[PDB]
Amino acid sequence: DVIREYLMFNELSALSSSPESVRSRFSSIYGTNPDGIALNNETYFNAVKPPITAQYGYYCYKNVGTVQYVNRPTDINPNVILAQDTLTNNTNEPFTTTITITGSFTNTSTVTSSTTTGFKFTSKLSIKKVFEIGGEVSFSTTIGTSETTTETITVSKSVTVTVPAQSRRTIQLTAKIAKESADFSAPITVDGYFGANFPKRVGPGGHYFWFNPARDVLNTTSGTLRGTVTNVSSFDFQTIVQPARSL
Ligand SMILES: [Lu+3]
Ligand SMILES: [Lu+3]
Numbered sequence: 001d002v003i004r005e006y007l008m009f010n011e012l013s014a015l016s017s018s019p020e021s022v023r024s025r026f027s028s029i030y031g032t033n034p035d036g037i038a039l040n041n042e043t044y045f046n047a048v049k050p051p052i053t054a055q056y057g058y059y060c061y062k063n064v065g066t067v068q069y070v071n072r073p074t075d076i077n078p079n080v081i082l083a084q085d086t087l088t089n090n091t092n093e094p095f096t097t098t099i100t101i102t103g104s105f106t107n108t109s110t111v112t113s114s115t116t117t118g119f120k121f122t123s124k125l126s127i128k129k130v131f132e133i134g135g136e137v138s139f140s141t142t143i144g145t146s147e148t149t150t151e152t153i154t155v156s157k158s159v160t161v162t163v164p165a166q167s168r169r170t171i172q173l174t175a176k177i178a179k180e181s182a183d184f185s186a187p188i189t190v191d192g193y194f195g196a197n198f199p200k201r202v203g204p205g206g207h208y209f210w211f212n213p214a215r216d217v218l219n220t221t222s223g224t225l226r227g228t229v230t231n232v233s234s235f236d237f238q239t240i241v242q243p244a245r246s247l
Contacts, residue, residue: 001126003064006040007190007214011062014117015190016219019044022194025217030202030210038195046197048209053195058211060192062119064143064225067186069129072228075179080234082155083173088247089163096162103173104154105234111139112146113227119143119188127229133178134231143225159239167244175234188223190214 012018019037023045027033036047040059043051053059082103089095111127124140131137141147155173163169193211203210215221 001064001067001124003121003123003125004061005121005123007060007062007192008120009039009042009044011118011120012218014115014119014223015214015221016117017217021219022217023196026194026196026210026212029212029216030196030198032198032200032202034196034198034210036197038197048197051195052197052209053193053211056195056209056211058193058195060190060194060214062121063189063191064121064125065187065189067125067127067184067225069182069184069229072181072183074133074181077177077179080175080177081172082175082234082237084170086168086170087161087163088168089165090247092165094162094164096160098158098160099171100156100158101171101173101239102154102156103175104152105175107134107151107153107231107233108148109134109137109139109150110146110148110230110232111141111227113141113143113184113225115143115188116224116226119223119225125225127184127227129182129229129231131180131231133235134180134233137229137231139229153234155237157237157239159241161241164244166247168247169244170242172240172242174238174240176236177232177234179230179232181228181230183228184226186225188225190218190221
């Protein structure tokens with residue numbers, strides 16, 4: 001998904017920064033410690049209200065770029081009993097009979113995401129992955145969370161079996177389980193401005209209010225989104241009729 005929202009003061013740590021470190025950068029740039037600083041609709045320290053950044057139209061945004069997916073090796077659980085039934089022959093004559101054996105399996109699709117430094121995005125992230133075995137999976141997800149959705153597969157199989165004279169005979173419904181997954185990542189980028197108000201006129205021309213691009217006052221202006229999309233499903237259903245065993 002293409003996300004673009006305001007950067008907040010409580011997310012400065014996500015850019016390895018702080019209001020104090022931003023203020024100190026403004027101090028270095030202009031040669032006087034500002035009274036206060038401003039970001040979008042917020043201020044910090046001894047600041048002019050309303051924020052000079054909104055007054056003067058200088059905003060600052062965090063962005064999620066294009067999500068890139070990388071397939072992980074698929075893990076296959078090669079045998080799982082979904083159903084098991086035993087036919088008992090208590091007579092002196094064999095009989096043959098057609099039975100139906102039924103199992104159900106609950107498929108899961110799981111999304112998880114995070115950022116390396118703890119950005120606080122509000123807009124849902126769109127995650128879509130087509131899995132070979134599991135098929136198409138999509139999510140609209142809050143970054144930094146986990147979600148699982150479920151779907152039910154019921155499988156019935158008819159089978160004709162002869163059970164000898166004094167014996168029982170077991171029938172199983174079996175499947176393989178595929179855990180399919182892909183890792184994903186997206187660049188986080190910050191662009192726009194911070195504001196500062198000074199106790200005296202500073203800078204070229206002598207002004208009380210100044211704006212500097214985020215890159216001038218923050219220790220970094222990028223980060224990273226990461227996550228995984230998993231699907232667990234059953235496939236390769238088989239009927240197993242085991243040899244008749246004596247009672
Ligand atoms: Lu194959
Ligand atoms: Lu196959």
